[PDB]
Ligand binder design. Sequence first.
Ligand SMILES: Nc1ncnc2c1ncn2[C@@H]1O[C@H](CSCC[C@H](N)C(=O)O)[C@@H](O)[C@H]1O
Length: 225
Amino acid sequence: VSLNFKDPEAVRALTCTLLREDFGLSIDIPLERLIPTVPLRLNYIHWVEDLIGHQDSDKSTLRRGIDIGTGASCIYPLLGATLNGWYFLATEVDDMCFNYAKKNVEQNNLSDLIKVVKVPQKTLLMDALKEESEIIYDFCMCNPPFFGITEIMAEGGELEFVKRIIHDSLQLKKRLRWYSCMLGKKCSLAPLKEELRIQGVPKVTYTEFCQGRTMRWALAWSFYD
Ligand SMILES: Nc1ncnc2c1ncn2[C@@H]1O[C@H](CSCC[C@H](N)C(=O)O)[C@@H](O)[C@H]1O
């Protein structure tokens, strides 16, 4: 395995070795798809913890969340379910990621806590949660996809993705307690904040995740007063 951390073979080896050593999670992921890095994925898991609230022992419940675009790694549910005993609905549109995510759930014996679903690509939350009338989800989380010489247009597409989540949230309302998404540039934040302000979303928060050279923002919102 390469010693140079610019090489994806080295990043993948480090991520997979970290997950085994610290958590006892063994994952298999293809170099064809985004290789998650663990420290940033953990920051977000902990931020979800802060958002959904600490429970006294007498009102402990199974926490339930939705990870939109779960990846080949199925990283956020594996971590959420392993650290915290959270249940996840985890969605994917990509066949290769779906196959891999399922395999990673099974191989870490977590099929009881994580349900991986392949949705259709024009769908987001509303189709996955349609005629759910029995429980309220505590959260959704999302690390969004980036959809000539200038696909930094790809990076800009994160805005339209989040707006779709905002769109679904406006109909689902209190069916989930906290909607959230990680953002790739701090200049995605101001327009999204203004979009929630003008739709009258009552509760909005945000935070920073820093891993050395790399900086991410996450935004979250709720229709609960
Ligand atoms: N409408 C949609 N519903 C569910 N997943 C989607 C989607 N649109 C794109 N995706 C998936 O979202 C993923 C974003 S990349 C994030 C992967 C993983 N959560 C991680 O943090 O490493 C991709 O695998 C892409 O296939």
